[PDB]
Design a binder for this molecule. Structure first.
Ligand code: SF4
Ligand code: SF4
Ligand code: SF4
Lengths: 630, 630
């Protein structure tokens, strides 16, 4: 029970140990104690003269072989890892961009499922949609976006300019952190982190901010916009979470990864090939999602969430996973060893991600339907070899109400006020019924008790009338904890509980809205950004003035560093539950946590205790409230 | 003595030690012993769950926290670092591309100084040279190149396809390693190295090969082409090397870095402002070059080479360096603390490379002349403040003949055979007078006795009648040792000495050709590639079959890893004199040293001893000679 607060973990972990299967919790214990030079950021291997390390306490070397000090080594490493997290989101968004162009060229595998989103995004990009066919609007949209990936001049990329408020554009301009072309910025910054380059810690951090902007607008914002257009804007849905949503009677297919280009097709063809599953001796095809692609088909298709990042291995330990299909990012390579001990088939689909011991099924837009059919047909084959003596499906599962895109939030608020939908939300923030709103994002990290920080932070926040929106694996944690159940409004403060109830009864939902609003996947952090921009514009202020905060309680991936930097660049104080590899430098840590506030509005807040973090986040919100004369 | 074979280092080191200035040799001593996990490549920090380390002897954990094994950790790290080195050369070649585009738009800072190179490259790119103007050709050339940085399709790079033999194009197509877009391949590969991505070591190395092809054709080849066009193809020159080229009576300005867009303008405006130095009480303005940018002004302006990478700090220790101007790459940040102890002014010029303590003069195309005029004037100001009591200029220097571009080599060969200029070189290879030709490239590395590996490897090679071409800091080492002196032919084998004499007097040089051919900077390693391609086509054969080999005796930068991967991609066995962070995994090391030969023809060869490496590189050529039956 010391591993996690998720109730299903101990039994599934003990079941894995009895079978001699290595889990993420065992490999961490085997690494402790971890290297102190790497944890603090005082180790450098950016050239083959290294490794070089720096003694923070003044006895060993105070510079690398090239002469890099702690302020250089730490800041240079932060820029390279933020650049890498940005490259992940950009390459993700770029993948969806290819399908949008393939829709413009007339493909039958995908289509424009949300023309309302198309007209709205096209209007944001400056496209005049009058007298234009849908195919001409998609054609012109792809041309504008590709020009960002081809821009060779000093012009800021269009997808940033069209989606950012004016005050942010002026602040980023006077700091010189505006990105011009996402691919070019990734190449320039990666060049800037090679040996014998930038030795200015401020100039490096100023470039780290620019790649956070690349990540937020060429990665998060672009992906969410195009994914809503192609697959539909999420609207409120009811379903369940945690590994109890697996069914022994059904064929169990788990989708894992990030890009819904694969998981939407698996959901489509799981429904159409369900007769073949019954002919094999099963009630149907049960679908569950792990990580962000699980959040995608949760927000659009109501597919229940299996589990988050740290417990992806234990999903197969249930013995009921017949197939797990996978694309990119956050896929533990250990799943091949774990699926080898079972009938479970692990399937990889992307050319840049292969796992020895996993069947590779090439998935392209041309072959999306036939590759999807083969994958679930492999799962129907795999269901019949299942060993019932090795299945253990936990009883724990929680009710979740998700699908809260900005479009869905406005529609729910329009029941109270049709002309000014944000006004009921803003008036209650002003009155004090809602102290502030906090975005809890990020992954799981074995250094933190699994889901423990996510849940403990949010419970302390909603108790103080602090609305919580969430994405990614932080959303999985709050989902399995029952905090997206409408019944959880009892755990929120009376001011917040009244507002949640008022919105719920005005939508004829019977009960109140849950205290935690699920706003989608990691890329759907752009929705959160779009929301606080809309709130700030309503109040005639900047997001740096809003009584808000962001938090990554258990982050692990380089994508979280980029997102955190993006939120900092957006003017939002960003809390970090895990110690970043930067604390070895006094200057860099002071810049990222104090100097950044006067520079750009936001700052990082490092706090490993959930209760200390919650108290600090609430004090930051009250400070913003006091400056707003509330 | 123990530190270096460069004769000027010990006295300059003791002079720095006397003054209390820590050098690169000092900081390397303070790091010993270095972490065994990083040295072997068995340490990962690609996520904030780390650092994860694996025992090289295989005792403790053998998988990372995410489950990544030693094969995944080393190969994933190798791809990220090769991708990092590819972004350095691509960003270099991209800066020269912007200048070429400005010439098409009518700038007065630069122009086409070698119209014949321009017309030869235009023909290679498919441009019909005749009956169109120079501005037309430049504009047509720029659009073809920017298309490569904008290609969203599966079509290979135009710059790779136009400069590759058909066998390499066919071999790379089967391996799926053809690059499409240099900027996109960096983003996609950097994405492929984040956590939870590719777990296939072979698939990761196949992408490393692709990023080597990005580095060679979108970085090395593109830079060398457009720099010859803008500044002139190098032709044979006579000059000097080593730190004896600093003169106490002159204003000594050292250019340091890699991009000749700055050093060419400094050379231009150091001559035009010569009178202001004489008015300041000086004999004139003496220019010397450190690292690759010194090689650039060496090949085109005859500027002497001051020193290479490891001894860049000791140049300021001579007390005569009045100003050191710097752009990008391989710049030790310790230079600011060392210049702070002198009148020397360190000057940074590029926005991605600033160094606290060094003055910053922003260098752009439209302000190239103005910024250059300002910079040498700063040196004239600093000269008048030079302390003569702390000046110690070594007397050692060497006679250097360089400028051996592919164009310069063939016309020196055209004197011996005007109709078929390459015939004398080919016939002496098939006869045995030249056993083969070997390229020595790369930087310095404090892990190796300074220049000891470079010189020792070349002495035995030319002794065995192996012609040697070199670039980068390997060229600096051989230049200071007098191996580019015509007298050094005496050290070459008796069979190889004859062809050197038959080329010198045939060009009315009198002195025999040096056994070492300086072919330029590290981007000028494409010249070596252009020569190998020409030689292989003359023999109707693939470069993997030529009696050739490459060597990085003392590499350190990630740019050398990229170039080494490009050489291996060119079918050339690449020797490595420094242990790469890869040996911790036997499977990955065996793929790079053995399995790669069957796939692509080339392979890496790790050998820390110069005599065993020489014997091994020599033992590799006769085997290739036997396969040709010579
Ligand atoms: S860049 Fe400097 S600190 Fe980093 S590994 Fe190389 S020598 Fe060491
Ligand atoms: S972080 Fe650095 S010092 Fe620590 S194990 Fe890794 S290579 Fe060694
Ligand atoms: S990627 Fe895997 S091996 Fe690397 S630090 Fe993260 S958990 Fe460890």
């Amino acid at each position: 029970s010391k591993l996690s607060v998720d109730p299903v973990i101990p039994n599934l972990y003990r079941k894995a140990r009895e079978e001699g299967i290595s889990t993420v919790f065992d490999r961490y214990e085997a690494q402790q104690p971890q290297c102190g030079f790497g944890l603090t950021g005082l180790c450098c291997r950016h050239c083959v003269q290294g490794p070089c390390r720096i003694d923070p306490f003044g006895e060993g070397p105070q510079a690398g072989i090239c002469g890099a000090t702690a302020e250089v080594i730490t800041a240079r490493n932060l820029l390279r890892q933020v650049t890498a997290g940005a490259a992940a989101h950009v390459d993700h968004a770029y993948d969806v961009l290819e399908v949008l162009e393939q829709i413009a060229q007339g493909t039958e595998s995908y289509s424009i499922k949300d023309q309302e989103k198309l007209k709205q995004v096209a209007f944001t990009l400056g496209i005049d949609t009058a007298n234009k066919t849908e195919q001409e609007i998609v054609e012109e949209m792809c041309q504008i976006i590709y020009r960002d990936f081809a821009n060779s001049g000093a012009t800021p990329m269009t997808y940033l300019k069209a989606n950012s408020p004016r005050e942010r554009l002026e602040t980023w301009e006077k700091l010189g952190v505006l990105p011009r072309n996402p691919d070019r910025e990734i190449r320039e910054a990666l060049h800037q982190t090679t040996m014998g380059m930038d030795a200015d810690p401020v100039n490096l951090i100023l470039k780290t901010i620019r790649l956070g902007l690349v990540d937020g607008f060429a990665g998060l914002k672009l992906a969410t916009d195009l994914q809503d257009i192609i697959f539909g804007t999420p609207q409120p849905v009811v379903t369940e979470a945690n590994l109890g949503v697996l069914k022994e009677d059904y064929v169990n297919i788990i989708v894992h990864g990030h890009v819904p280009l694969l998981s939407e097709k698996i959901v489509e063809w799981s429904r159409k090939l369900e007769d073949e599953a019954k002919k094999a001796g099963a009630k149907g095809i049960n679908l569950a999602g792990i990580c962000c692609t699980g959040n995608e088909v949760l927000m659009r298709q109501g597919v229940p969430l299996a589990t988050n990042f740290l417990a992806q291995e234990l999903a197969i330990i249930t013995g009921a996973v017949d197939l797990m299909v996978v694309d990119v990012q956050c896929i533990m390579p250990s799943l091949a060893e774990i699926a080898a001990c079972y009938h479970t088939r692990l399937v990889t689909t992307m050319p840049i991600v292969k796992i020895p011991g996993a069947e590779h099924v090439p998935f392209t837009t041309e072959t999306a339907d036939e590759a999807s059919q083969q994958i679930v047909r492999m799962a129907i084959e795999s269901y019949q070899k299942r060993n019932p003596a090795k299945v253990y499906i936990p009883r724990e599962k929680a009710k979740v109400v998700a699908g809260f895109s900005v479009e869905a939030i406005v529609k729910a608020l329009a029941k109270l006020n049709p002309d000014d939908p944000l006004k009921p939300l803003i008036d209650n923030i002003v009155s004090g019924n809602i102290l502030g709103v906090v975005a809890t994002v990020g992954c799981n990290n074995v250094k933190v008790k699994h889901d423990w920080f996510h849940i403990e932070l949010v419970k302390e926040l909603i108790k103080n009338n602090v609305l919580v929106v969430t994405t990614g694996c932080s959303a999985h944690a709050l989902a399995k904890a029952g905090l997206m159940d409408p019944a959880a409004a009892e755990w929120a403060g009376e001011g917040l509980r009244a507002v949640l109830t008022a919105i719920g009864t005005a939508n004829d939902l019977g009960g109140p809205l849950p205290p935690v609003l699920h706003m989608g996947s990691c890329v759907d952090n752009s929705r959160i950004g779009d929301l606080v921009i809309a709130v700030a514009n309503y109040l005639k202020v900047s997001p740096k003035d809003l009584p808000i905060a962001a938090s990554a309680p258990e982050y692990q991936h380089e994508k979280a560093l980029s997102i955190g930097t993006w939120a900092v660049a957006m003017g939002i104080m960003t809390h970090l539950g895990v110690v970043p590899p930067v604390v070895g430098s006094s200057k860099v840590t002071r810049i990222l946590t104090q100097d950044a506030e006067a520079l750009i509005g936001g700052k990082f807040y490092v706090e490993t205790d959930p209760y200390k973090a919650a108290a600090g986040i609430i004090e930051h919100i009250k400070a913003k409230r006091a400056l707003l004369n509330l």
